[PDB]
Design a protein around this ligand. Structure first.
Ligand SMILES: O=C(Nc1cc(Br)ccn1)NS(=O)(=O)c1ccc(Cl)cc1
Ligand SMILES: O=C(Nc1cc(Br)ccn1)NS(=O)(=O)c1ccc(Cl)cc1
Ligand SMILES: O=C(Nc1cc(Br)ccn1)NS(=O)(=O)c1ccc(Cl)cc1
Ligand SMILES: O=C(Nc1cc(Br)ccn1)NS(=O)(=O)c1ccc(Cl)cc1
Lengths: 317, 319, 317, 318
């Protein structure tokens, strides 16, 4: 039997006997993602070049507007916005959403894969909604996932019931369920990080990468892949296994990726898929944020691979 | 004035006062590329999953390119990554061109939605003999046209001819390649290097030294950033657009490299050269290698000329 | 604020505090309509003509499979199938659906507008589902409407809250609400029927049509339009006002159009729009069917026009 | 073997050993039609209705105008949308005159009736500076003509010396696929098409002819009637299924209603190349010598037996 994202989400919502607010949220997000996909694939660019005589801004506007008009949210955090957006009282629902509307867009000029990252929290207090409502550990996530605009467009959705992958069929504008209850390989064969920063590496990262190229147990050296677009690199890690690292460097003593709308959602996707996500010192999802745009280092992926990194990290204390 | 691929090729062809065969070939290829793009983006996948109650993407791509080229009446010999022997076009449909292509490069990892691409190189049949596989045994220096389609965040066709390199964005709303970047040139020196560093234990000593110099610059310059998608079209395009260097060099386990000369290396070398870049095997220009086997491999280092020259300096230093 | 079909239906469902089965039904139906639209616009026809070296059956299969897989239906009546389709027990829900999956398809060779017509009933008895659960008068309809595959694709959805029109944006595959709570003109200026068969007209039809062409007073004659596709002619009647006739005659004393999946859905839409729909002797929606494929005469459209027709009809009765 | 619009046209041009200007014009027209189809099907309408927080006939006109100018193949353009002939700037002048209706039937698009684009292509005949007069040629002089129908699917119908060919737009890939080669219309059909709402104004010849279709004097089967009210849709059905299409003069339109330059002549040319007929009653449409770019004509067109039958009645009434 075929299944779509909205039908899948409605069935789960009707099972849980919820109010329907989360379903409305996820449906609105789905609409926004289809619109972002259409723009990313350059539908209508001929009009820009004069047939009849931006992108990260448009993406942000699409997610902002669809989430506001969902009547399901009260606080919105975007990579694109300096302060938290507070929804007007008339359109408020109970959820907080942190999102990166077009991750990797800085390199979109070379048509690299790009993506949308989102994480959903329930507002916990009876206080007036404020920026601090988004300062929750990733453990509190109700849902998270990403849309990858790669060779094809796919939405990966993680909830308590696990991780599910939906392929956007552009012929009919429907997300089709193609991978149910996804789990990541226990051990991979690919490591993913920017080795251009080798001079700035923590000794623990240096040692670990050396182990990937020169295995101590006579196994084959790992392959290296680094797209430089987080959603693309993390998705490949989910599908084929292995390990993704964005550790600290000289420019980024707290890492470079953003905790709320980059690290936490992927960490949630990884953990719900049987993977792991760590800063080195603790689980990503256990970090308690104090600033909506704060950075965190992240090592994530297949559990054996992450544990091997953490084994190395602890050796260097 | 807006400009499209087919219109651009027609005007350049009318300038050259050619017979129109090359225009017909390229327009047929453009149709195949649009069809490959549609299938790659998974149009119609709902039917595969039972919405109404099947070929692999690289087989479909090959069939699409094969059929459109045969029916263009502009070709006589077709070399595909997918086929052991060159395909000889039927006599009724023969034209004067030989085309070597990789119909869907990078498809082995397509399960993770990595960018993939189509690569092509176009030669004129040089001999008066009846067409045969030997007609594809030409150095890249003989290319008439070459280029690639990148199926990335958007679909783009990069086309190289004597007049230079031009980039066309596929507008999927209307099925037209729109000219968006004219007479494209690569940066003289870049800041990114691209190769699979996981196989470092097998590196040639010159490759080890150069990569070390990019990470630990001896002259107090900034270290280069690293990017490696692992799909040749994606890495080559990023190299073209942002500058830098792409390497799949020879090593101890692979003394001739891994990438294929006819339908991977030569077209990408041709594009680099028309854009002011460089492409070498280490020993010589990729376009100067004289192939002896249509599926032979060649090592390739390509990209910004300053970066490639710096690599050859290290390579010659280690003899 | 933008509004889509599934979001519209969800909010209406949350107001009614239903179980969500109807919402799942309508979302499933919407998915089928987008797929029918894509096929009707001939997406992928290049493959049929050899680029790499029926339509009403596909449409029927699309609606059938989406409705079965919704877990919302138990009996399905289709123009394409001799007998009622009984949903297997594991997939049974509470609704009965009557539909014409591709109406007007007999003339699709000329690319004439085509459409999908549907009517949704609540199963009334606890008996085992059977053909008899579809023998309900149109008065019992829960929802009805049609999809028009014309210059653009539009879904017209009629419920208790009135008639609403949704335009398919094929760039993103979303039905966008473009006309809310539509009402038909009290009186129109267009009559619609096949005048080529005038020799067999009932004398009342002959008189009424003559009055449209040769008005007894100083008014303008009505214009004539007859697409020959019921969905197209009925939609124009809804949009511009006027009257559409497929009446009974001596050779066809029960009309030609089918009650369950042509007349009743359109009659329901007309009545929710402030229009009228009659067989000549009674309202279409009051006919109690005895056969899932039974025919009915139908005259529908603007109320002043349908009443004027009934004046003439009663004169010859 | 598969064939596309551009490939078909190129092959015909290489056979004719022409300069390539007509191929370029037709390729430019094909692009504009695909863009018109996309807008007609409402791609991107969600943005108009606020998803992120031109009228179609104006847009259609801009698409055709801009694509034709930039083709470098035209010198004078007549559009239903423009009061005067548009003269191409000298740098972009080519040898062809094009008369077109960029979105015919758009007045009823609110009900999603099929709409279409109609075009007729002439070679500029005089050596004078390009002017509005270059479009005042009889349809007999047409080099190419046709239409795109935005119906259930989008189809481009193209008539040239080699006959009539029909290309279906595949929206998945944006390619017109040749699906019906060298099309001919049925010698006699079973459908007549006209707005009988003007029955009180009909000349006796039309009234009599229509009576014969409904009540045939030989007691054969009566014709069925179809009238979409969008000319491209009605003429296309007439081409595909045979029969007869009529728009005669009436009191509101004593010179007929349809436009000679960019409605009657192109359809007349397609009909004639398909083995059909197209008449004003008095003469062949293609023989009318126009004096005004927006002038109207009565038109009766379709299957040859059916139009000849109309003309017998017409002559009977003098
Ligand atoms: O959507 C609903 N309920 C619902 C939906 C329909 Br249709 C009809 C009746 N009820 N509840 S929810 O809280 O939004 C939720 C969504 C997803 C998940 Cl996994 C859990 C909870
Ligand atoms: O197509 C033509 N000529 C041509 C085309 C038309 Br339409 C009308 C008249 N002439 N010549 S060609 O040899 O194919 C060629 C194409 C591109 C380039 Cl860059 C060079 C050569
Ligand atoms: O969907 C629901 N309820 C619902 C939905 C959510 Br979300 C959360 C809670 N309840 N009810 S329904 O029976 O499907 C229905 C649909 C449309 C209409 Cl007009 C009436 C009834
Ligand atoms: O296009 C050409 N020639 C042409 C085309 C290519 Br490709 C390569 C070389 N020459 N000539 S044309 O005048 O445009 C024409 C088009 C269609 C028809 Cl039926 C007749 C005449």
């Amino acid at each position: 039997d075929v299944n779509t994202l909205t039908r899948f989400v409605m069935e789960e919502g009707r099972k849980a006997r919820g109010t329907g607010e989360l379903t409305q949220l996820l449906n609105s997000l789905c609409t926004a993602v289809k619109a972002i996909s259409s723009a990313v694939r350059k539908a209508g660019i001929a009009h820009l070049y004069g047939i009849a005589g931006k992108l990260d801004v448009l993406s942000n506007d699409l997610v902002m507007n669809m989430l506001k008009s969902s009547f399901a949210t009260c606080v919105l955090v975007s990579e694109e916005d300096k302060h938290a957006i507070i929804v007007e009282p008339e359109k408020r629902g109970k959820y907080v959403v942190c999102f990166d509307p077009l991750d990797g867009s800085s390199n979109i000029d070379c048509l690299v894969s790009v993506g949308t990252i989102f994480g959903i929290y329930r507002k916990k207090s009876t206080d007036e909604p404020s920026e601090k409502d988004a300062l929750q550990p990733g453990r509190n996530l109700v849902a998270a996932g990403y849309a990858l605009y790669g060779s094809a467009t796919m939405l990966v959705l993680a909830m308590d019931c696990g991780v599910n992958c939906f392929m956007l069929d552009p012929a009919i504008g429907e997300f089709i369920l193609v991978d149910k209850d996804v789990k990541i390989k226990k051990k991979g064969k690919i490591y993913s990080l920017n080795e251009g920063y080798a001079k700035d590496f923590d000794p623990a990262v240096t040692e670990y990468i050396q182990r990937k190229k020169f295995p101590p147990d006579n196994s084959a050296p790992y392959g290296a892949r680094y797209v430089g677009s987080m959603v693309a690199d993390v998705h490949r890690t989910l599908v084929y296994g292995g390990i993704f690292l964005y550790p600290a460097n000289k420019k980024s003593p707290n890492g470079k990726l953003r905790l709320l709308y980059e690290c936490n959602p992927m960490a949630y996707v990884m953990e719900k898929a049987g993977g792991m996500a760590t800063t080195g010192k603790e689980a990503v999802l256990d970090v308690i944020p104090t600033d909506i745009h704060q950075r965190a280092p992240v090592i994530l992926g297949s559990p054996d691979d992450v544990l091997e990194f953490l084994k190395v990290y602890e050796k260097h204390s």
